Amino acid sequence: KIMKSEVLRVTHELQAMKDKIKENSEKIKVNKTLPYLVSNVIELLDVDPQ
């Protein structure tokens, strides 16, 4: 089980990600709170020539 000992670092990086997403995921409520007006959307596919 000496080869599977590196999984703990991966889990620490994952839980560190879940611990660090609270800020940038928290600003969604204060930045995207409410659209103050209404705007109509018309779809038109464009081509640039990722």
């Binding site: 590196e6 703990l8 670092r9 620490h12 990086e13 560190a16």
Partner: protein, 191 residues
């Protein structure tokens, strides 16, 4: 409470995985760092704990901070390369003690030595003269050995240990299958 900085240096050589001694004692001394950092946290949570190795290319693993939540994660991926390096191992922390936030925190650096020293007596008396000159508390902890335990390190400590009144202590652990936590926790430095 007590206002002082804690610096620990662990060995990353391949001498820490021998089957005669403890079964990969790296985790045992890791738990020692855990109980001394949690013990200092229970005494005074304002103390910062740093992590760095003694390899050829020294790398600052964790900056001095009281938050051990990420230090517990940084204790992994030790990158077991190199054998031993003493000069820049002392100079990488004893000179970096000025980068701490709190200037009132005393200077205290420990180190886990798991490989024989390659420097001659001249480097021992020069580095010992520098450490005694700048008056930094130095605790010598030697895990594992090949030659005799203390031949020149005795004079290294006696010439390095100043302020005999409540000064620094020497930690010498004998061979044995028992854990090292209770043996290194005996002096007053732990707790």
């Amino acid at each position: 409470m007590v206002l002082e900085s804690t610096m620990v240096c662990v060995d990353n050589s391949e001498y820490m995985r021998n089957g005669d001694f403890l079964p990969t004692r790296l985790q045992a001394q890791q738990d020692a760092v855990n109980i001394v950092c949690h013990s200092k946290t229970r005494s005074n949570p304002e103390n910062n704990v740093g992590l760095i190795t003694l390899a050829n290319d020294c790398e600052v693993l964790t900056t001095l901070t009281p938050d051990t939540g990420r230090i517990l994660s940084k204790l992994h991926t030790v990158q077991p390369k190199g054998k031993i390096t003493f000069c820049t191992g002392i100079r990488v922390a004893h000179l970096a003690l000025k980068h701490r936030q709190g200037k009132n925190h005393k200077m205290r650096i420990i180190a886990f030595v798991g490989s024989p020293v390659e420097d001659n007596e001249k480097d021992l008396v020069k580095l010992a003269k520098r450490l005694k000159k700048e008056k930094v508390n130095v605790d010598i902890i030697n895990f594992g050995e090949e030659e005799v335990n203390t031949e020149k390190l005795t004079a290294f400590v006696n010439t390095l240990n100043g302020k005999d009144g409540t000064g620094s202590h020497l930690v010498t652990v004998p061979p044995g299958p028992s854990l090292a936590d209770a043996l290194i926790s005996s002096p007053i430095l732990a707790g």
